Amino acid sequence: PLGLGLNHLGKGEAIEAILAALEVVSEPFRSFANTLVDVCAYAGSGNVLKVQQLLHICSEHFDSKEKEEDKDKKEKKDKDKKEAPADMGAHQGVAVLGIALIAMGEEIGAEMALRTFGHLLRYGEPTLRRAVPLALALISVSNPRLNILDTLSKFSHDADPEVSYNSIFAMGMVGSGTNNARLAAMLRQLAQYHAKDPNNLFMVRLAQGLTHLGKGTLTLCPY
Amino acid sequence: LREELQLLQEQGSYVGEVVRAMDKKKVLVKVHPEGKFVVDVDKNIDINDV
Amino acid sequence: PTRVGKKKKKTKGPDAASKLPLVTPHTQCRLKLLKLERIKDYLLMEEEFIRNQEQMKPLEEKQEEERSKVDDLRGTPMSVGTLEEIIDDNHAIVSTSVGSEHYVSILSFVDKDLLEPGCSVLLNHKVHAVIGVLMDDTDPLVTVMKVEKAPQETYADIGGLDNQIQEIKESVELPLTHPEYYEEMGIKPPKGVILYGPPGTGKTLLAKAVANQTSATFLRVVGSELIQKYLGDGPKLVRELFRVAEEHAPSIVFIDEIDAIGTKRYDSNSGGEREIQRTMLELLNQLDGFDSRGDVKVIMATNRIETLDPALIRPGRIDRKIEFPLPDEKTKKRIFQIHTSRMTLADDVTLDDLIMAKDDLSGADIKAICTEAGLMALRERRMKVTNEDFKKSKENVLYKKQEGTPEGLYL
Amino acid sequence: PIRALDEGDIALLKTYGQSTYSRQIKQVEDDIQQLLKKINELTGIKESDTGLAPPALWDLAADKQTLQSEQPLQVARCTKIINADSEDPKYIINVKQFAKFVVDLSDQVAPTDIEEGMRVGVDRNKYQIHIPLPPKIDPTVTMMQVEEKPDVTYSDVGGCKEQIEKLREVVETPLLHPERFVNLGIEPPKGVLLFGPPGTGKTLCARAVANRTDACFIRVIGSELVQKYVGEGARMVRELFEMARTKKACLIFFDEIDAIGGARFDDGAGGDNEVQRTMLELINQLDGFDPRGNIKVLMATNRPDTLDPALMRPGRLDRKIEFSLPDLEGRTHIFKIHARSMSVERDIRFELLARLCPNSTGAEIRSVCTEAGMFAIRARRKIATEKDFLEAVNKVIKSYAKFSATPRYMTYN
Numbered sequence A: 001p002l003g004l005g006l007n008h009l010g011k012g013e014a015i016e017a018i019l020a021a022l023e024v025v026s027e028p029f030r031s032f033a034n035t036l037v038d039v040c041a042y043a044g045s046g047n048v049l050k051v052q053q054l055l056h057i058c059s060e061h062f063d064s065k066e067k068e069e070d071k072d073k074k075e076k077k078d079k080d081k082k083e084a085p086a087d088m089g090a091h092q093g094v095a096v097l098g099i100a101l102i103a104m105g106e107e108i109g110a111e112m113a114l115r116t117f118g119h120l121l122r123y124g125e126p127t128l129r130r131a132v133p134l135a136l137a138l139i140s141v142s143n144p145r146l147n148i149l150d151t152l153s154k155f156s157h158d159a160d161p162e163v164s165y166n167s168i169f170a171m172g173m174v175g176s177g178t179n180n181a182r183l184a185a186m187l188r189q190l191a192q193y194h195a196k197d198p199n200n201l202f203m204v205r206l207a208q209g210l211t212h213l214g215k216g217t218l219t220l221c222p223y
Numbered sequence B: 001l002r003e004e005l006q007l008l009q010e011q012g013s014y015v016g017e018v019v020r021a022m023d024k025k026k027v028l029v030k031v032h033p034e035g036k037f038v039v040d041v042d043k044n045i046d047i048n049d050v
Numbered sequence C: 001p002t003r004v005g006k007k008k009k010k011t012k013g014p015d016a017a018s019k020l021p022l023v024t025p026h027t028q029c030r031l032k033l034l035k036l037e038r039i040k041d042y043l044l045m046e047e048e049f050i051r052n053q054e055q056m057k058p059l060e061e062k063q064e065e066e067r068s069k070v071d072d073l074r075g076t077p078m079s080v081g082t083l084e085e086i087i088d089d090n091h092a093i094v095s096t097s098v099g100s101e102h103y104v105s106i107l108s109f110v111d112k113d114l115l116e117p118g119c120s121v122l123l124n125h126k127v128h129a130v131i132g133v134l135m136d137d138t139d140p141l142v143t144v145m146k147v148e149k150a151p152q153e154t155y156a157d158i159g160g161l162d163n164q165i166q167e168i169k170e171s172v173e174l175p176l177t178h179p180e181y182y183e184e185m186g187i188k189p190p191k192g193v194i195l196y197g198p199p200g201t202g203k204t205l206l207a208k209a210v211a212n213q214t215s216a217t218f219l220r221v222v223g224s225e226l227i228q229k230y231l232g233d234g235p236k237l238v239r240e241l242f243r244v245a246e247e248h249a250p251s252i253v254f255i256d257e258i259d260a261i262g263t264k265r266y267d268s269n270s271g272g273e274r275e276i277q278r279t280m281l282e283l284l285n286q287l288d289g290f291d292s293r294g295d296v297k298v299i300m301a302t303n304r305i306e307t308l309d310p311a312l313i314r315p316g317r318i319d320r321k322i323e324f325p326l327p328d329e330k331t332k333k334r335i336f337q338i339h340t341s342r343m344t345l346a347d348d349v350t351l352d353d354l355i356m357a358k359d360d361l362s363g364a365d366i367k368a369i370c371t372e373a374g375l376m377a378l379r380e381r382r383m384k385v386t387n388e389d390f391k392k393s394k395e396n397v398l399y400k401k402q403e404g405t406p407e408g409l410y411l
Numbered sequence D: 001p002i003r004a005l006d007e008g009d010i011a012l013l014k015t016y017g018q019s020t021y022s023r024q025i026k027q028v029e030d031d032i033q034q035l036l037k038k039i040n041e042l043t044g045i046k047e048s049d050t051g052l053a054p055p056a057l058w059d060l061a062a063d064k065q066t067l068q069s070e071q072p073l074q075v076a077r078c079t080k081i082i083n084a085d086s087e088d089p090k091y092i093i094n095v096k097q098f099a100k101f102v103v104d105l106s107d108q109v110a111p112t113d114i115e116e117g118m119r120v121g122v123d124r125n126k127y128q129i130h131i132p133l134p135p136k137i138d139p140t141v142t143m144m145q146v147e148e149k150p151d152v153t154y155s156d157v158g159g160c161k162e163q164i165e166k167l168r169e170v171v172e173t174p175l176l177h178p179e180r181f182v183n184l185g186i187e188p189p190k191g192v193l194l195f196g197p198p199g200t201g202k203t204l205c206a207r208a209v210a211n212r213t214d215a216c217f218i219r220v221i222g223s224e225l226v227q228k229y230v231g232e233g234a235r236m237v238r239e240l241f242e243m244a245r246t247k248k249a250c251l252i253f254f255d256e257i258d259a260i261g262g263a264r265f266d267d268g269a270g271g272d273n274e275v276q277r278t279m280l281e282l283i284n285q286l287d288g289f290d291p292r293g294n295i296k297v298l299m300a301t302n303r304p305d306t307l308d309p310a311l312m313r314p315g316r317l318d319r320k321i322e323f324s325l326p327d328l329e330g331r332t333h334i335f336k337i338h339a340r341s342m343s344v345e346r347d348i349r350f351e352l353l354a355r356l357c358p359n360s361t362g363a364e365i366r367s368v369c370t371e372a373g374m375f376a377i378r379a380r381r382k383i384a385t386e387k388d389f390l391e392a393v394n395k396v397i398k399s400y401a402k403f404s405a406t407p408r409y410m411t412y413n
């Protein structure tokens, strides 16, 4: 369904939702694709009425291991429509998703809801750059911890090389023995070696001139 | 008058200053002349009222 | 090992204010009507999402039987005790407030790894048994001094002080945001900063603007705040002050009006003078005394500087001395410009009338002139403010400072 | 003749000028600040969780054993014993806070190990001795035994080739060669005071001997001696001068003994009374009956004038090492210490810099070395030039030491 959303990216006409969702009227594990082509056409604007239906339908329900992928992907589409009102909703995005999910969540927060910060900005600033090791130095190893170590990986999804080496190398020191090297010894050094990619060429952040997109989005959002 | 007489025949309460609250209907109170205490709240009072 | 105790398992709690400091039209425009309604949209949705969060929870197990009997295993009036020694046969010794010491056991689910003589514990009444251990143990006098709100506007609020704005940024903001420059020369950033000068110049503003735009936490100390009467209560609060700052974030501490905390350390005849003088002599010890400091910055401010203790002025403790002189005929224009931002200004006025003609007056004088001239418009039934308001206002504010200094001897 | 307010004229003001967006923009800001509150009490996620272990190990204990350790287990107290009498217990026992009882031994004791002055577990009902205890160790001297090396080598205390030489004689040399003092017939001094201007290097010499000691070293926090209760600070002195006698040759470092007593006066009938009791208890366990033997005392102060002549007597403080300012050869060595580990030009000279700091300390020299690199970050450089240091001297010294002598200088060239 992702190539469907890429073939219909960036128009708030809401005909594409009438096209796609009535085309794959089906069982709910195929209606996982309902939220894809809905909001892939909804790259960036103020359409807050969509952002409430991006919450209120599949909010929590506690959902004993049936549609937990869909509430992650509904949260995946909360990540965009946030990265270009030019910081007006970015402070509101980090205020909500810091409190609501990683605080009073479950599978939505503690597995997947850090990829917002791996999608919102790639500039780096110590508000969110220090809020992620609040949930990373606390690895919370009881889960399949490569969920939280996936949130380790694209915590370093901020380009423009920085002083962030203090975090990654010191977590790589505790990450050699503990946070076992069978699984993520590729990953921590993937995070280490990506910030200093070259010296230069860090513009991967979908904003040209002042604010226009330049997609861009079709090449990142698959990852 | 009999209802007034029965309620007065009852042991008095203690006064104690709340330092700050714990979670789930618990606070942290030194009374006056003792150590601190973690106690439970009644029905009519709340955590947000503290 | 190499990473012993992994440094106290402790996160940091910064501020929660500055939700959206972008109200930049600064006038009655529809943008600020549009911008604030967007803020209304996100906070109502944050309300309704967490309202749905406590609503649609059909999960009840309530302890899976483990903590529920444990919450009934412990007594309901939970009390507070103090360790003296540790007899590790699951039967230790404690001490109460009066000093009644009891050979209590350890009723379980407590790891014997974070309990030290001095750490306060949780006890029972019927058997006085150790149930839990009390954490964070802060005396509620230092938690009052913990700022949660960014009070005023950013560096663009004050009216031009840029040579000394760049000084304080070199020691507070720049080492925390970008400490890659300092490792290339191995130079540690400066620690202590004195703000001194005549009153009414901008000392209190420069701390509030730093406390607005920051990332670490913030502590304010109002002068005679650490002064008590119990002869040891004075220096004991200073230890807990730097203890809280060290245990939390790599943060800064602002102690204002330190002219009531130091004067040249002389010895004299009064006995209450010494518990004053002793508390102020161990602040010297906690600051730059024995081994280490941590990442704690100290900002201090007075009006007079020559009446201080020379033990505090020396480098190692304070590395920056910053003068705040009375303004000029150039940056004074920026003072009048900012304090006349959102007032209806008639086109008859010239700002350079009162600036050039009189060359003596502080920045706090200029705010009083702008408020007084606005009162003169309502005094004669007006909205706009003309030159005649500022003619009467520049008089009425300045008549609080005496006539002069000597007659025409000099020429 | 100036009055301009009447209730009808109030209604003129708040309708003239933006009647459309005045309240329309205001109550939006008002109820959002109400909504800042109503989010906070709706969260309520304070969560001061402590005391609990990981909930995967205590499951065996809190099944029956915790209920088995409520009623059979005892809430017995510890006490102290005065003495005993023959053929019977007749045990006389105090609490020092409660009363003094005369009680019996229980069945679970051996009647031999009920020696006098012993902490013993005492019943709550009939107050019988059950379990004897190991003796009490003092809890706060354990807090101030340093058990830690601060990393300062003697190669960082440059400019003090002779003050270290005096200090090497007292501390280090009897602990490693206790022969030549006896084999000539002399005794080493046991107390050294350090005095002089601030920022001169008092703490460095104390910090560097904690590195190379191979012995017991005790930092003493000075204001722990001052307490709230009467006589409590004098008891803290005693426990310090008992355990030093147990082990051999432990070092005790006081610091800023100006605070813990400088003068003994009484004219207004009162004042620093409790401070004097702690201070005089320090004296009688320093000299008097029962000399201490191998206990070395180091003190340091900034204001040596205001100290008690009872401490100025040799026999308590024997060597008066003072710190002065380095003349020129000291300072040229100090610049090479504090600027060797920084990116500089490899051709600059330091003797020209030591000229321009005539009356300066080791702290002021290091502040020049840190400030000169800060000028390199004002520009965009990664190495320090000669003019970086020359502007730093004017920034540190000349910005505060002189302002009349530099522009109006023409009396001296």
Ligand SMILES: Nc1ncnc2c1ncn2[C@@H]1O[C@H](COP(=O)(O)OP(=O)(O)OP(=O)(O)O)[C@@H](O)[C@H]1O
Residues within 6 Å of the ligand: C157, C158, C159, C160, C161, C198, C199, C200, C201, C202, C203, C204, C205, C206, C302, C303, C335, C338, C363, C364, C367
């Ligand atoms: N450079 C400036 N630009 C703008 N406003 C200023 C400036 N200097 C002072 N003010 C005004 O002065 C007030 C702040 O007072 P200030 O910070 O000078 O107090 P202070 O220096 O601590 O005085 P004191 O030393 O007497 O306590 C503010 O209300 C502000 O409007």
Ligand SMILES: Nc1ncnc2c1ncn2[C@@H]1O[C@H](COP(=O)(O)OP(=O)(O)OP(=O)(O)O)[C@@H](O)[C@H]1O
Residues within 6 Å of the ligand: C288, C311, C316, D156, D157, D158, D159, D160, D197, D198, D199, D200, D201, D202, D203, D204, D301, D302, D334, D337, D361, D362, D363, D364, D366
């Ligand atoms: N002789 C010296 N050689 C090298 N560095 C010195 C010297 N003297 C002082 N310094 C530097 O000055 C700094 C401060 O010195 P220090 O605080 O030890 O002086 P102090 O005399 O102990 O001060 P106080 O008298 O206030 O206790 C030290 O960190 C040290 O780096």
Ligand SMILES: [Mg+2]
Residues within 6 Å of the ligand: C203, C204
């Ligand atoms: Mg002030």
Ligand SMILES: [Mg+2]
Residues within 6 Å of the ligand: C289, D202, D203, D204
């Ligand atoms: Mg010192």
